[PDB]
Write a protein that binds this DNA or RNA. Structure first.
Ligand SMILES: C=C[C@]1(C)C[C@@H](OC(=O)CS[C@@H]2CC[C@@H](N)C[C@H]2O)[C@]2(C)[C@H](C)CC[C@]3(CCC(=O)[C@H]32)[C@@H](C)[C@@H]1O
Ligand SMILES: [K+]
Ligand SMILES: [K+]
Ligand SMILES: [K+]
Ligand SMILES: [Mg+2]
Ligand SMILES: [Mg+2]
Ligand SMILES: [Mg+2]
Ligand SMILES: [Mg+2]
Ligand SMILES: [Mg+2]
Ligand SMILES: [Mg+2]
Ligand SMILES: [Mg+2]
Ligand SMILES: [Mg+2]
Ligand SMILES: [Mg+2]
Ligand SMILES: [Mg+2]
Ligand SMILES: [Mg+2]
Ligand SMILES: [Mg+2]
Ligand SMILES: [Mg+2]
Ligand SMILES: [Mg+2]
Ligand SMILES: [Mg+2]
Ligand SMILES: [Mg+2]
Ligand SMILES: [Mg+2]
Ligand SMILES: [Mg+2]
Ligand SMILES: [Mg+2]
Ligand SMILES: [Mg+2]
Ligand SMILES: [Mg+2]
Ligand SMILES: [Mg+2]
Ligand SMILES: [Mg+2]
Ligand SMILES: [Mg+2]
Ligand SMILES: [Mg+2]
Ligand SMILES: [Mg+2]
Ligand SMILES: [Mg+2]
Ligand SMILES: [Mg+2]
Ligand SMILES: [Mg+2]
Ligand SMILES: [Mg+2]
Ligand SMILES: [Mg+2]
Ligand SMILES: [Mg+2]
Ligand code: NA
Ligand code: NA
Ligand SMILES: [Zn+2]
Lengths: 204, 35, 121, 123, 57, 113
RNA sequence: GACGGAGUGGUUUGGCACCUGAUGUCGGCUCGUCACAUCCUGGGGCUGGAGAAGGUCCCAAGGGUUGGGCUGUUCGCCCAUUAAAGUGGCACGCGAGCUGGGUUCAGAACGUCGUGAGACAGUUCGGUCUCUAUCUGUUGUGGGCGCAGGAAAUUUGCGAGGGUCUGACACUAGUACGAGAGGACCGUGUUGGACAGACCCCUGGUUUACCGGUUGUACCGCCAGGUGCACCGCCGGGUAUCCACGUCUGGUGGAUAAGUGCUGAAAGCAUCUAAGCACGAAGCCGGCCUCAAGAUAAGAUUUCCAUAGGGUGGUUAAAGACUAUGACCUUGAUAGGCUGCAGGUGUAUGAUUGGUAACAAUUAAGCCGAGCAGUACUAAUAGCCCGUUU
RNA sequence: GUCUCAACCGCGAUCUCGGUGAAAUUGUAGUAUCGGUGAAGAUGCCGAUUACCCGCAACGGGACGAAAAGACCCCGUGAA
RNA sequence: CUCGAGAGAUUCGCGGUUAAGGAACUAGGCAAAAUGGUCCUGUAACUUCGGGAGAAAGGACGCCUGUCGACAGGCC
């Protein structure tokens, strides 16, 4: 179970024990239950939540009929979480106090996009040779890609250049520093994937 | 020392029917809960 | 941040003056040694008529580094040089006096250095 | 990567790029409208609008600061004369870019940039 | 480095599947009635978004 | 709204200190611990750098002790700082005094203001 | 474990001469992948195993398996570590991937042989490593059509890939065992090293945005004040972004192997097996993370249409080679500007007053502000096309 | 910054668009994988396996890739 | 300097900076960094008596005031 959040930024705080802690500020805003999924109809049990208020100009008619059925204000983001405890129904509202009993959380996000990257940065390759001592033009090269006539091919899973980042990433067991119900704010120790303003899933 | 103790009970098994062996290591002041 | 081939000042009255790090102990590819770490050195130079000899192999403990050291309270400390103190086979120090400041990290490793140092941090 | 690098190098070295932006700005102050490419005109907008904002504080320091950019005394004479009076009430957005088409020789996107307070038909 | 074989007619034509001239994005001018590229000033009349932009002699 | 600014206010630590700039000579009363005994250990030197944002600045103070240079970085909001007193008001022409690392006595002296 | 004997393999030296109008060769670098005949870590049987430490054999390939001195070296010797510094195959893996120290061209010299031209179970100094990737292969990223009407979302997971390491201390306990020296199993805990992922609050780096000092010289008609050029002229700083040297997080029931047994006959006894049954590994499968319905077997759910929904276009981005993706397009804060603020630099131009002067103090510092907040001033026209909309 | 061990910055090349436009190479090709077989090292044979149609960027394992009628080695009642 | 315009991936060419360490790189310090000017001090072994030698190692250097290139005071 969990809620949807928005990454705000990082800062550092001093604890009561007198330690300097890096913290990440997340706005785990109010989430409405937009659809209840059950065994007998869907094959599994889960809750679909909606997070960011959306204007009607930005909501298509199929999605408008989706929120109107649940009788809630239309939302911009939708996600599913499982294994709750309390049997929330359509149109209920959840908030940061859900985590007021939580010691650690998981944060799922999308990492920053690096674009197309070479083997040195994508996979940490050593590079060919030195910068001097007869080096010509293979300073950031991958080297050999396989053996000779047997195999006579490049194996699947060979590490090469390509797109790096902009992908789903999970960070586990983040210590909760404080919950602020007034501002829908959650404080966790450490860093989380993604740029400022990105949408995060926080699992209890 | 005196920070745990070993507890064993035997439960019948649906796969076969004969008694298996259940084992753990719980702190000394918790076996009465287990048994 | 001391590694193999680094040269350190010898900061006790053991007779040695300059030392060269041969190995950072405690791990297969342990790259660097900080304050309070144990290293193996060769003595590169000595004062005339000293006890230890030039070219001897010895264990030592780092007391000062140029790279700043982080503390859990958010403070840092750095020094103008890298310095160590020679130790004997039984783990004790081979000298009487310590010259210059030493870091507070050694309060958890060796009380002999801290007791007889002019200042800690 | 170029995350959050907010200025166009325009395919030129830094000294070349600064010289072109300064020559172009002088041309816009002297001739109220000039025709150029779209990428060059969008880069001039970020360059010339703060310079036109300096004529709201008519002092020796403002004129000299502006002159350190243009280095052209006819542009300074026009900028702090007729151009200053026309824009005295507008809160930014002194210039306008309108696209026109493509060049014959390299198919470059073309446009015109002008001072808004000198175009009567668009007011 | 070198082609082992010349390509057949079929293989060459299959690659050229994605070689297409791009069509302009055209619109009619509400003043002139002439074709012009959307989001540009009509070169015939000089108008743009209902207002005169390039008074042409 | 602004959430970093809310958090910084809720987790405010430390006490007010008198203002000082780079090139000033200050004494830091720092609280240390050794065998469950708390005592204050003075550290006096010249401020060579201040960096950061707002109430979260960090300053670097340098002193020469027994002929060895020593540098300490202090968070301004730390609860371990008891007092800051300014001994001398220095006179410098720049923000960062990294050049004092290469000057010995009679050449590292700073004019008063 | 002698004297002897039977096999297996094809990584050594050979034997044969079957492929070759050219099938690049030693060592190293880079990148790996596979085997197990296992170096460490896991599980066992025996011991000439008191304990501790070993010896030997069996099961086990999940992960891991150092840096230097000498040498072209492989290999070795040595130094210091480590839990350990495994053995092999892949054209003695890998030169359209690198190098070119060695070998094996033309110069020269030594020893040696030859009358000599020259030569070497030898030695020594020097001596050009070519090619714009067609097919396939591999890593990424799109276009079309399909999915039994068309669409906007949320999904299950058939399966695939990734991940899998390990030390040292404390207590139990100076106890069991042992005249004694020494010194445990089992079980709780506390802290490290290496590796990987994400991130930029901190430390540190960059920062041809920016600010300042300064040399030479030429321009803005002159002075003062600026600017061009000299590697960004040189020097000192430096936000955002990108980073590591930084910070945070991670390596989490079933069926078995070698083995241990219960009950128990064939075979009156014996027997873990023949009928049954209880155990038993870092290994297998689940569990963790990512992808994943072209899974043509093309799945499921909610809603819309039969103006649903899109394309082209525009302002743009922490998204990006081109694409694709995200936000916004006037009943709009998408970008710039403007107005303030965090911030960088470090006290401007002028004007007084000091000083004989070079200079200095007052007065607002001045400039910049890739970040933040507000604000329609500028640019975002529903025009055209498929099936009311920006 | 030779390296531990790399990080960042600038221009030129690179990528996209407009204009012009070669070359080496080429029996025909709708040119997948594994093991086997085989002029004894297989895209093309056998048995299985996997794979909707068509591009772009990037890297070099194979096509005993390209170039040059092997200089080594032997042979010719060859040559200098 | 007879092709341009955009954009600002990988990679290459030519350049710039870099914490801590400082030849651990490599066949080999290859390449790069470092030194560098004028004047005043001071210069070893060895030597064919010429040299070695610019051996090595040190110090001063801008502007203003006055005094006889130098001296002293002052300024950044
Ligand atoms: C020229 C032939 C090469 C490049 C190399 C050849 O090496 C030799 O000929 C060593 S002799 C040497 C030759 C040059 C003379 N100037 C001096 C003399 O000393 C070598 C290693 C083999 C022994 C024969 C086959 C081979 C293909 C596979 C391979 O590994 C190659 C042939 C076909 C290859 O094209
Ligand atoms: K093959
Ligand atoms: K920065
Ligand atoms: K705005
Ligand atoms: Mg990106
Ligand atoms: Mg490297
Ligand atoms: Mg070369
Ligand atoms: Mg090169
Ligand atoms: Mg094409
Ligand atoms: Mg073989
Ligand atoms: Mg051939
Ligand atoms: Mg085995
Ligand atoms: Mg080989
Ligand atoms: Mg080659
Ligand atoms: Mg090859
Ligand atoms: Mg010869
Ligand atoms: Mg030579
Ligand atoms: Mg080459
Ligand atoms: Mg920051
Ligand atoms: Mg910093
Ligand atoms: Mg000039
Ligand atoms: Mg220049
Ligand atoms: Mg010139
Ligand atoms: Mg029986
Ligand atoms: Mg509109
Ligand atoms: Mg360029
Ligand atoms: Mg073209
Ligand atoms: Mg075969
Ligand atoms: Mg085959
Ligand atoms: Mg060939
Ligand atoms: Mg021939
Ligand atoms: Mg460095
Ligand atoms: Mg340094
Ligand atoms: Mg070496
Ligand atoms: Mg080496
Ligand atoms: Mg050189
Ligand atoms: Na002879
Ligand atoms: Na701004
Ligand atoms: Zn018209």
């Amino acid at each position: 179970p969990g809620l949807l959040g928005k990454k705000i930024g990082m800062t550092s705080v001093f604890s009561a024990e007198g330690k300097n802690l890096p913290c990440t500020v997340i706005e785990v805003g109010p989430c409405v239950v937009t659809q209840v999924k059950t065994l007998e109809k869907d094959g599994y049990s889960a809750l679909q939540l909606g997070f960011v208020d959306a204007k009607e100009k930005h909501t298509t008619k199929p999605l408008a009929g989706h929120f109107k059925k649940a009788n809630v204000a239309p939302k911009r983001h939708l996600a599913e979480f499982k294994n709750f405890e309390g049997e929330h129904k359509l149109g209920d509202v959840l908030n940061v106090e859900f985590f007021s009993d939580a010691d650690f959380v998981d944060v799922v996000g999308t990492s920053k996009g690096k674009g197309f990257q070479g083997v040195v940065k994508r996979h940490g390759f050593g590079g060919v040779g030195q910068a001097t001592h007869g080096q010509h033009n293979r300073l950031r090269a991958p080297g050999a890609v396989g053996a000779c006539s047997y195999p006579a091919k490049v194996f699947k899973g060979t590490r090469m250049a390509g797109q790096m980042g902009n992908e789903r990433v999970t960070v586990q067991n983040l210590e909760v520093i404080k919950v602020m119900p007034e501002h829908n704010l959650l404080l966790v120790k450490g860093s989380v994937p993604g740029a400022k303003g990105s949408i995060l899933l926080i699992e209890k | 020392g005196r920070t745990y103790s070993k507890v064993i009970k035997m439960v019948k098994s649906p796969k076969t029917g004969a008694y298996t062996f259940q084992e753990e290591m719980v702190p000394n002041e918790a076996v009465k809960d287990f048994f | 941040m001391i590694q193999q081939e680094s040269r350190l000042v010898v900061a006790d009255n053991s007779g040695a003056k300059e030392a060269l790090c041969i190995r950072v102990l405690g791990g297969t590819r342990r790259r660097y040694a900080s304050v309070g770490d144990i290293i193996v050195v060769s003595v590169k130079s000595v004062i005339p008529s000293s006890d230890i000899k030039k070219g001897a192999v010895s264990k030592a403990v780092i007391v000062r580094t140029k790279k700043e050291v982080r503390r859990p309270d958010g403070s840092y400390i750095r020094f103008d040089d890298n310095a160590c103190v020679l130790l004997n086979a039984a783990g004790d120090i081979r000298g009487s006096r310590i010259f210059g400041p030493v870091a507070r990290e050694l309060r958890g490793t060796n009380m002999k250095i801290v007791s007889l140092a002019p200042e800690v941090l | 990567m170029r995350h959050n690098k907010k200025f166009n190098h325009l395919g030129r070295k830094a000294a070349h790029r600064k010289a072109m932006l300064s020559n172009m700005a002088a041309s816009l102050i002297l001739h109220k409208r000039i025709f150029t490419t779209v990428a060059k005109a969008k880069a001039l907008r970020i360059y010339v609008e703060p310079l036109l904002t300096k004529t709201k504080e008519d002092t020796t320091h403002s004129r000299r600061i502006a002159f350190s950019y243009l280095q052209n005394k006819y542009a300074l004479k026009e900028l702090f004369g007729d151009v200053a009076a026309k824009i005295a009430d507008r809160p930014g957005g002194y210039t306008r870019i309108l696209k026109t088409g493509y060049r014959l020789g390299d198919n470059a996107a073309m446009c015109f940039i002008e001072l808004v307070d000198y175009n009567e038909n668009m007011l | 480095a070198h082609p082992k074989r010349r390509q057949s007619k079929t293989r060459t034509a299959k690659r050229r599947t994605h070689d297409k001239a791009v069509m302009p994005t055209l619109a009619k001018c509400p003043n002139c009635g002439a074709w012009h590229i959307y989001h540009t000033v009509c070169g015939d009349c000089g108008y743009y978004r209902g207002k005169l932009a390039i008074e042409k002699e | 709204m602004d959430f970093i600014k809310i958090v910084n206010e809720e987790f405010k630590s430390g006490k007010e200190h008198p203002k000082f700039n780079s090139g000033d000579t200050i004494t830091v009363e720092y609280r240390i611990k050794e065998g469950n005994k708390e005592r204050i250990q003075k550290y006096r030197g010249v401020v060579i750098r201040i960096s950061g944002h707002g109430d979260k600045k960090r300053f670097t103070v340098r002193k020469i002790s027994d002929g060895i240079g020593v540098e300490r970085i202090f968070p301004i909001e730390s609860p371990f700082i008891e007092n800051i007193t300014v001994e001398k008001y220095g006179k410098v022409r720049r923000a960062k005094l990294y050049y004092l690392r290469g000057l010995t006595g009679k050449k590292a002296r700073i004019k008063e203001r």
